[PDB]
Amino acid sequence: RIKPSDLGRVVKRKGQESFNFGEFFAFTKVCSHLGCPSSLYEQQSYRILCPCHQSQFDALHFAKPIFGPAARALAQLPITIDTDGYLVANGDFVEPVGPAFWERT
Amino acid sequence: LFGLAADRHLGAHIYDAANGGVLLWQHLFWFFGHPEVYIIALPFFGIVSEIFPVFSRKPIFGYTTLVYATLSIAALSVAVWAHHMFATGAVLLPFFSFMTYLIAVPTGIKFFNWIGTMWKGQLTFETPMLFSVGFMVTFLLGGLTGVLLASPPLDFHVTDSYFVVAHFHYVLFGTIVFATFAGIYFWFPKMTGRLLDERLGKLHFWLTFIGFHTTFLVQHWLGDEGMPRRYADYLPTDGFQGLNVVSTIGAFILGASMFPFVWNVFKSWRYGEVVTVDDPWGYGNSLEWATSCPPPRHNFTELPRIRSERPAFELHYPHMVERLRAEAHVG
Amino acid sequence: WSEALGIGWPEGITPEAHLNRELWIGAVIASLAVGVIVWGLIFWSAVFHRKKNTDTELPRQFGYNMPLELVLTVIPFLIISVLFYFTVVVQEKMLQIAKDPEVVIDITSFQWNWKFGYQRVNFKDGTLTYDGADPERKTYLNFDKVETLGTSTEIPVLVLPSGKRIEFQMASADVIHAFWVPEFLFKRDVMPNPVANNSVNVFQIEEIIKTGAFVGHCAEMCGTYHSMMNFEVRVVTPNDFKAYLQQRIDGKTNAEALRAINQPPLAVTTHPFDTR
Amino acid sequence: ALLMRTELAAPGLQFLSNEQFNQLFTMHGTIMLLFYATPIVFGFANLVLPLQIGAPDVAFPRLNAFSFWLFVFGATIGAAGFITPGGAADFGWTAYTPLTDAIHSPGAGGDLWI
Amino acid sequence: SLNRPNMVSVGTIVWLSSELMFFAGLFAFYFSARAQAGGNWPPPPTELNLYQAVPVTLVLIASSFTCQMGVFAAERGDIFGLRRWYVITFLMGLFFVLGQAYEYRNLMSHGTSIPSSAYGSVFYLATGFHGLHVTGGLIAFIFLLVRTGMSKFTPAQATASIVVSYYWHFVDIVWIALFTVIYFIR
Amino acid sequence: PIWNLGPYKPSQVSAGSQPDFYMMWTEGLARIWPPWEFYFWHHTIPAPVWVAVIMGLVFVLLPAYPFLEKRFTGDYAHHNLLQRPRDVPVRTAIGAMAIAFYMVLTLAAMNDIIALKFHISLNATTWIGRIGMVILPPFVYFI
Amino acid sequence: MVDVTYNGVYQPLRGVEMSRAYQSALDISFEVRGGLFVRQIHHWAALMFAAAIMVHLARIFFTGAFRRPRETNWVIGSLLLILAMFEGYFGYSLPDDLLSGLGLRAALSSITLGMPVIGTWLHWALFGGDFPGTILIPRLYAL
Amino acid sequence: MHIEARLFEFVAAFFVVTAVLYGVLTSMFATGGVEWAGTTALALTGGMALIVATFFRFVARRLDSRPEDYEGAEISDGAGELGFFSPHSWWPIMVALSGSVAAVGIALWLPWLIAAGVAFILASAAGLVFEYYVGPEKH
Amino acid sequence: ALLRTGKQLFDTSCVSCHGANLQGVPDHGPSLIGVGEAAVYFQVSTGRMPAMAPRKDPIFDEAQIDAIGAYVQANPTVVRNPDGSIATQSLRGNDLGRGGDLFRLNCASCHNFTGKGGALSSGKYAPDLAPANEQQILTAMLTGPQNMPKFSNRQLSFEAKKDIIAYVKVATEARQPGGYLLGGFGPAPEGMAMWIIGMVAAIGLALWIGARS
Ligand code: HEA
Ligand code: HEA
Ligand code: HEC
Ligand code: HEC
Ligand code: FES
């Protein structure tokens, strides 16, 4: 849940404009570098670290890799609200999740 | 420093504000530090003392007096440590003021000995004695600033200002840098067997001197009013804005002054004039000029007689022993 | 004319400042005279004796002039003794510490900003009598009801009368600080527990001749933002000072008190720094 | 010092921050005071002491090499405070009492300096 | 043709002077703030066990006596007497160090620690450097004994024995000075 | 101490990394490699393929060294007596080359511990390694 | 790889679903008298083996005994080094805690799937399908 | 050797005079009474000078005249063999490296690093001591 | 009563960074409005006090901390004992399994497996959990200091907090049954110990046993 204060530096990746719900983004976890899960989140710097190889991803810039051997941006997931006020998935991933291979991402 | 590290890592309350650690640590640190700047002075006074006679072609003036003055400075150097405490106002004023005014005199005695040494001599203008002249001029200015600083009411207003900065810059630089370069210019043939160029040395000296007295003269007029040291910014309302520009210009001038020296040294380490005989600067002293210019292991293969403080001079010129021993005590 | 000879020292506002400047001018004149003498001696030696022509064997091997050395080593003793005696006499007049100061102000210093106390008021003419002592304390710090406190964006201001006996007591919170006023021609450090460290935190001013606003800065290494905590002091007439006193007695801020007596609200010589 | 002089001119903070400025004069003063003057004095001593006194060699060459390498390694360790993200010791080379304790300046640079 | 004065002797004397001023700084640390506290300036939870401090002082005095006996043996042509005296001194110093360790354990067990009070901190700071110097002296003893046991005797070995001997004597002198400063004057 | 750890699950991860030190060079090479990728018709080759190529080349070079040296120097003589290390500068220089490369690769992946014990920037240490494995080798070779 | 409950001796890990192999490892580490000592000896000895083989190879390379009479010996030594390194890599992975699981996941899954040509075939052959397999641990144990 | 002892005892007398004068002037006319900080330093440096002068006198009062202390002596008087001097060696750089490691360890609080530094210091000292006493291998 | 004393104590030094009325200087620090006394208690007791910010000794000692916290509240409250003191034993949990699971799911990621120091990017790091007590860690996880993911009391049960408390206290303090502790890291310290001790003694014994020529 991003702080609602700024809400203006989000890049809103060219194909995923409406996949965010206000203060919600719901990013994936499997790093695209080798597949190590990433849990290192820094709220003030809006950065995500992969502890295996110390990657970085700007949560404000479509989870784009900025440093380290990371290659492509992490997958994103749309969400919405149900009738009872819960959280449900708005669809499915539009890119393959996991390390890239010979056929596709 | 052991106590400070113990406090930092364990919290031993040695320098706590509750106790008088504020005065304790300052007392001990200054008692250490003032002899520290007193250390870098005496050997370089020696450097200029034994660089004077070779170009003056005269015996040193006041030999035993010079030794007495050096001993007096050495003894009293650890009895004035508290004159850094005037702003604190918790120490004895007149005692340390009197001690500082007493320790001032032997430096003047050294100045008088040097001026007598160079008085009425066959002076030849080369790079080492140019460096010596700049050294005495800068050290005289710094000593005047220091003897001005010794007044407690004066430092009750001028402390921590750029005036003290100019004081210590003047004295420390004017001794160490100038005498280091002069001693390098002198001893380089002894160590390497090669002689440095004189035109490049003269240009280096002139550029260094110009840059130094250009960048470090307005500091009196800047620190006289309100501008204490260690400030990263100030306001545009007050004046003294162009003085900082002049200081920066002079500092930039001094910055490029080092390049001619290093270029000349690098060129002459492998190339340049080669000294094949002992003592290229004739009329040497202090016994180093009795061996080959490239010194082999253990530095000696022969030893001459030891009869005075100028053994190599008498060895090379035995026919002025009588003149040396005749008119020595005339004055 | 003498201002150039004074090496840019700002004009005195207190008799001891004038005495200090007189001593400084005399010492500067003497030092300049000595330096000129030695410079001329060096130049004369390096110009005429330099004439090493093509005909010379050896100038002279002489190095013993003991009576002359004694004369030249005794001569500076007289001048250093004279200046030491003058210094002792002058500095004695600097520490009068009168038993009955007219106005006592408690200076509170802490990390990166100042604070003013206004301890008490007592006038010899019997016009002003007030004590601002606060038993709020239940530790070495001093607390008062009427107190001037500063902020990173508001320049602290001190209001002081003219021609009065003024006293200040040092009291710091964490680190060393040096209360300095360029126009006072005086400086002094501030220590956490000067009584526990056996140092004098008390100094007094006889009176101030001129009036107006003056700048001040601290004069030690007290952290990072050491140079962004200047302060201003305002000197006013006794009646205006009294009026400001009773105005601040009622609940009012610094700007309101200064504005209500026909005075600029903020400091004129200083302005806040934007990037902090 | 040249970087210092560049920054201080043109009043106002052009490109240098305050804490880095403090680090700057701390390191400059420390280096020029306790890593140039004393080693150069001892260097001239080593050059011209046996030659002035005429002795063939020094008493303890092992101690001489020990002192030289100790000084060099200590200088390298102390000057290596610029790699710390928090910087080296920030107080001036005077190093007064209350700012040098554990309360203020808790960075690792002070230990390296000491 | 060898110079009658020995350069090792004067060098070790100068080094001895250096650590003398080091312990001088230690004493300056200790005496400071002692007068700051009034009345019973030692804290009430502190009490020195005199029944253990004097015995280790006598232990060190006996160690020093064995040291001068060993150096007197060294001045003449025999090494086994030196070895015996030095071994006795080493054992006595080991007992001394163990006694100090026991005193430290007892003091820390039911009271003062380094961050507890100023008096405990200064006392521990003063005693720790002395203990470290004693351990260094023991290491020097071991090194000297091993050096003597692996080569023929030379005057250099006697010089090393002498310098170690009066270094230990200086250690004894500074220890008794510290004990008189702390436990008697209080 | 496995008991201090926990059972493996896909959703748990932490700074626990840097496996045993005798295969550690592969992890270091993976960490240091710049992110170069190629994209052609519905295909993508990721960065780690270069790591596989480098480790395969290291595999190949190890047994091929004697033949390479024999063909380079053109020596075909029998020897039963060894050579002291200070008599063959070229081979010792190549050995220093290899050992320095291995050491700089090993210490590069100690980035977390190095930045933790010693307060150093993680990015700074990564860049130090990134310049080190290329500029350090020639210096030690010449030295 | 069948999920089970601990309900053993180590109280902080009671009632947590976990792999059976990790349960056996904890059993031999805590329940059997002295098992921890023996397994620690095993691991430390393996580390000693790796260090000793590296030092021996370095000494052989320095001495230059790899000339014509003994080149096949050098080739055999290289192959021994490679196989020992791989087998040691397989060593710390049998007690599949989260650290070893992460290491093997990263290395094998990433490099094997990253092959430009074969890729998925090799990974699916090794793991029998997706990365988390029921046959991976027994196969690794047997190997 | 007499001049050096005379200078050392002169320094001792000066230090003693300064220490006693400072103590006297700090006893009275002082806010804090006895300074207790610089007085100890002055007294103990005076004691340093006293003890070193005493040692010099003791080694000089039982000493014979040397050619260097005798004016007019000839270089042939001092002819002979001087003391032993260490030739080229490399132990001190290793000892300095170990000392630097120990200093780094005591800089940032890592007890394992300080223990390693202490062990390396002991090893380097052992290497330095035995550099000129180990004989041939026993085989 | 206590409010005035707390306000005076804060205004003695707090205005220099944050503000007289807790306003917030734009380029110095935050505004200090939403956060309660829990934030002040954690930031004061631990020792990350005004710096030039690693661990440091506290300035205030358990007396005025409550006063300044109450003063901040008037402009998330700590858990206190029924007798008026701060809770110290009631915060200990009973179910260790859930505490360990939550530690490995949300705690261990940044700090360590055993709670020691952790490595982050660009300066700041993860400190060791040893020098912190139960009240400190509870108010810290409830507060969300810099570079911290702050946790709401709604998303985490109070039983979950006590289980975390018990697990962190048991894990760090209990003596390791494996002998000497090598820092709690991975195999890198093990390999370093190997290089420094293992084959060093081996080569020493080889030199002793063997001859050299
Ligand atoms: C090499 C370095 C060096 C040298 C040689 C000196 C030499 C002198 N210094 Fe300086 N000083 C410093 C470096 C040095 N100083 C430093 C680094 C600081 C403070 C650092 C810090 O706190 O930041 C300092 C601070 C300092 C202070 C206190 C400043 C302050 O804290 O407010 C004072 C005042 O007492 C002082 C005085 C003197 C005097 C009287 C001499 C004398 O040795 C020189 C004066 C003597 C003469 C050469 C005058 C000419 C002599 C004759 C011709 C005889 C004529 C007769 C008379 C007129 C006397 N120095
Ligand atoms: C040995 C002592 C020493 C030396 C040699 C110097 C050298 C110089 N100093 Fe410094 N200075 C001090 C000691 C010294 N200083 C001390 C102690 C303080 C303050 C102490 C305190 O307050 O804490 C100070 C502070 C100080 C200040 C103000 C800072 C302060 O006091 O608050 C200034 C001016 O702004 C200054 C100027 C200079 C200049 C222009 C030189 C010139 O002489 C230097 C010329 C040299 C060169 C510029 C080298 C050339 C550089 C290059 C060309 C780099 C080449 C590139 C590579 C090869 C990569 N000094
Ligand atoms: C500018 C120097 C400075 C000083 C002086 C200072 N602080 Fe802070 N402190 C900070 C900064 C900046 C933060 C914001 C968090 C951070 O930077 O890590 C902070 C953190 C805090 C926090 C917690 C932050 C939050 O979001 O809840 C509180 C509460 C606080 N300070 C109050 C105080 C108190 C009490 C003092 C004691 C007088 C004080 N400040 C003095 C710099 C300072
Ligand atoms: C950035 C992601 C991040 C996650 C996820 C995280 N922390 Fe931290 N933690 C930090 C940082 C950064 C520090 C260093 C101190 C600081 O920055 O305030 C820290 C340090 C702490 C400290 C102080 C250390 C000490 O011993 O004094 C406590 C307590 C703490 N964390 C609690 C938790 C709890 C409880 C969880 C999860 C249930 C958690 N942390 C998970 C970032 C994190
Ligand atoms: S798997 Fe994320 S950086 Fe390697």
Automatic annotation (TrEMBL), chain A:
Superkingdom classification of source: Bacteria
Domain Rieske: 1-88
Compartments, record wording: Cell membrane
Function noted in UniProt: Iron-sulfur subunit of the cytochrome bc1 complex, an essential component of the respiratory electron transport chain required for ATP synthesis. The bc1 complex catalyzes the oxidation of menaquinol and the reduction of cytochrome c in the respiratory chain. The bc1 complex operates through a Q-cycle mechanism that couples electron transfer to generation of the proton gradient that drives ATP synthesis.
Family recorded in the similarity comment: Belongs to the Rieske iron-sulfur protein family.
Subunit and interaction comment: The cytochrome bc1 complex is composed of a cytochrome b (QcrB), the Rieske iron-sulfur protein (QcrA) and a diheme cytochrome c (QcrC) subunit.
Protein name: Cytochrome bc1 complex Rieske iron-sulfur subunit
Organism per entry: Mycobacterium tuberculosis
Residues of the full protein shown: 323 to 427 of 429
